[PDB]
Every structure is written in C-alpha cells, then in structure tokens.
Amino acid sequence: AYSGRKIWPQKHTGRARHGDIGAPIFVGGGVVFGPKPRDYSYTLPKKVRKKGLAMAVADRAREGKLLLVEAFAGVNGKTKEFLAWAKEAGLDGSESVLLVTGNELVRRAARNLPWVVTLAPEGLNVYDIVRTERLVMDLDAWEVF
Amino acid sequence: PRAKTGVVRRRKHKKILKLAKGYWGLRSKSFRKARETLFAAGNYAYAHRKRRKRDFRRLWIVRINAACRQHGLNYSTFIHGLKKAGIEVDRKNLADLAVREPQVFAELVERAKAAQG
Amino acid sequence: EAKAIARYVRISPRKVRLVVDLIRGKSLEEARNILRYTNKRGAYFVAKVLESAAANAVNNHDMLEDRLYVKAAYVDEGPALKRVLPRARGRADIIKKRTSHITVILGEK
C-alpha cells in the first residue's frame, strides 16, 4: 500500500508498540498469503485416462450399458424426435446416462440434455456418469484406437 | 476461498455464562472470569467430591462414640469387640440404628465385648 | 390504562431516579402537586408529562382523576452529544452529554 512509511515514537508511544505502518492488525491491513492466483497446476496422463472407466463401466454394464455406436432418431436437429428414439429404445428421465456423438448434427440438436449426455467432441466426463448409468459410443475408434 | 471469525468464540464462552448464573462479582458476568471459576468452582465442585464423602463419613464416627459411651464401651477396641466376634460390618452409616430405634445397638455392646471372656 | 412516556432528554438520568422513587406508590394528587412545587430542575418537565399522560388516558382511554394511583416510572438513560475539553498542553480532556429516558404510569384507582 506504500504506507505513510514509518511513523509513531517509541519508548512511550501510544503505550502499544509499533514502527511499521503496515498495521496488519485491522480489516484493511497486511496479513498472510491465504490464496494466491497460483491455483497450482498439477495433473497426470492417459496411461490412466483409460483404465479408470474400463472397470467402472464393466460393472455399469451389469447396470445396462449398451451403445448403438451410432443411431438415428430423425431430423437429428429437432430435440423431441431424438427422444422419440429414447422411448422407441427404452429410456426415460430417471436412472441417467450419457454418450459420444462426434457430429455437430445431433449436437446443434440435443440442445438441452438434462438427465442425459449430449456430447460430440472428446473430453471424457465419467463423473457425471456416476450420477447417471447407461450409455452409447461413436465407434471404438472414436474413443481412441 | 475466504474465511473469518464471526460467532464461534462467544458460544464457546457462552457455555460458561449458563453455568455461572448465581455467582457474585464478575464470576457471574464474564468469560475469562467465570472461566477462571470453572477452575475453582469446577475443581472444588468435583474435588469437593472427596470432600463431600469425607464429610458424611467421620460425621458418623462420633455420634457413634457419643452414646456408645452411654452403654459404656468405646470405639477403637470396641470395633475389636466385632472382630473377636465372627465377622465385621455396619458401615458406620447404617450405624444410624441409634438415630431411630437404638436399643438395637444395645445388644451389640453385649455382642462385641462378650468375645473377651 | 393510565400511561404516557419519558424519553428523548438532554441531561442526567440518575438525577431523575429518586425524583420518581420520591413520588412512587403515591397517587395522582400527591405527585402532581408536591413535586410541581419542588425546586431543582426535574420539576419543569415531569410536569407537562403527567398532563398529556392521563389527558388522553382519560380521553381515548377514559379514566378518572382523583383515583388515578401513581404506579411508577422506569429509571433509565439515553443518547448523547459529543464535545472535547481543551486543557494544559492540549491534552485529552474529552466527553459528550448523557440525555435521559424512563416510563409514565398510573392506573384506575
């Protein structure tokens, strides 16, 4: 704060000791380093970006996985109709699920995917699947060789 | 992420407040003060534990020697009158059978003593 | 039921106290008079007080003079106005001014 730089007396002083106008004693003075924009940059690899979901879904297949690897629904751009294949398939907002659709097509379509996935590109979101269940894929190749 | 103070402390010292009701000076209106009594009152309440028992105890002791001297006999050796007997009991508290209906004790003299012949 | 007020003063609340315990437990008569005719501040005020008190309490509250007993009041204090005191070597001779407060009450006989 470029403080008034040094101030009061000594010996006597306002009884209370001091010299440094940094006064880290009030609700506006210096203190300590609690945060730091350094939200710390730690991480890992793909040598695990794999194994994880492996064992997970297996048991999530004992749940009811499946995944046409590529299925229609209709206008692939009109939300409703997509779900029309939700029912003509066997799903309904309850036990949650997700999926990978590498095409803008159903993307610029699935719009608001509550209780559901609506992916397309690739980032991987296992977690949210935890709060969900079943699912579908875009070719084993799309997942990654 | 941010964090402050708030209400925590007061509570921790409010406990005292409640336990302090009835005390005199600051000991009835202070966290560091009443705190400082939870120590006196505290330790002395508990502590006064051995105290309280140590009280009602010997209290028995005398009232006992008191009228036992009436019938004649007296403590120490008296207790013996019990030993030379055949067992030993009464928890000098029960020895209240002198408070209400003592001639009960009377025989007890005849008891203890008689072992010496 | 025979009541008024006693707040928003400019001075010493403890100086009132006994002025009331002086005329507590009495009756409308007692107080109104005696004290009204008793020097040393307080008077000129507690006065206008009792006038409005039972004036309405015997208005939009319908009471009865003469019988209105002197319940009591609420010996209490108020706010202040700040002003420091100069001195030798411009020291710290400081203060303000305690105003006063308290309550007004009598009843139906």
Binding site: - | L38, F39, A85, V89, D90, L97, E107 | -
Partner: protein
Amino acid sequence: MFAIVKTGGKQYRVEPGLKLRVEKLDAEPGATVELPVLLLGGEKTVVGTPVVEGASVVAEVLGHGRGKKILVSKFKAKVQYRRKKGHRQPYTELLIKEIRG
C-alpha cells in the same frame, strides 16, 4: 420391620419393597427374583440376633423389574492452563424393586 446386607462395596438395608439405585449388574431386566446373603435383621418386633455373619443358610428375596438408566457427571482438569477437560461423564444406575429375605 427392617433388614440388612450389601451389594459390592455398598451396604444397604430396607423395609418392604422399595428401590432406587446402585449401579448395574447382569441378568436381563426385572424378570428375575435375585438375592444374595446378609448378617443381622432388625432388633425389634422380630429378632435380636446378629453374630458371626448370619448369612449362613440365609438370603433375601430381592425382586427385579429393571430400569437401567445412563446418568451424567462432568469433569475437567483445571490448574494452570492444565485444565484439559474436553470430557464430561455419565455413570451407571439400575432401577429394580426389592421384597425381603
């Protein structure tokens, strides 16, 4: 009339069928009629004889009707910043019902 014996470092006496407390001791609720030994009686309307023990071939009908309850206490060190409490207390307490001998 009165009567007397004990219950583990605690000598008691009674009259008819009263009961309050004296810690806890095994044997389910008060569905049983448990009873130990004794020593004197009550020099009055019926007696006048203690002697060596007395609990020889003689006991006392101590009814049950359990009601075991968890009480409370309250501790803390206290000295010179060595008051390390963080520990109140309870203690046992059984509720049953006597009879006699």
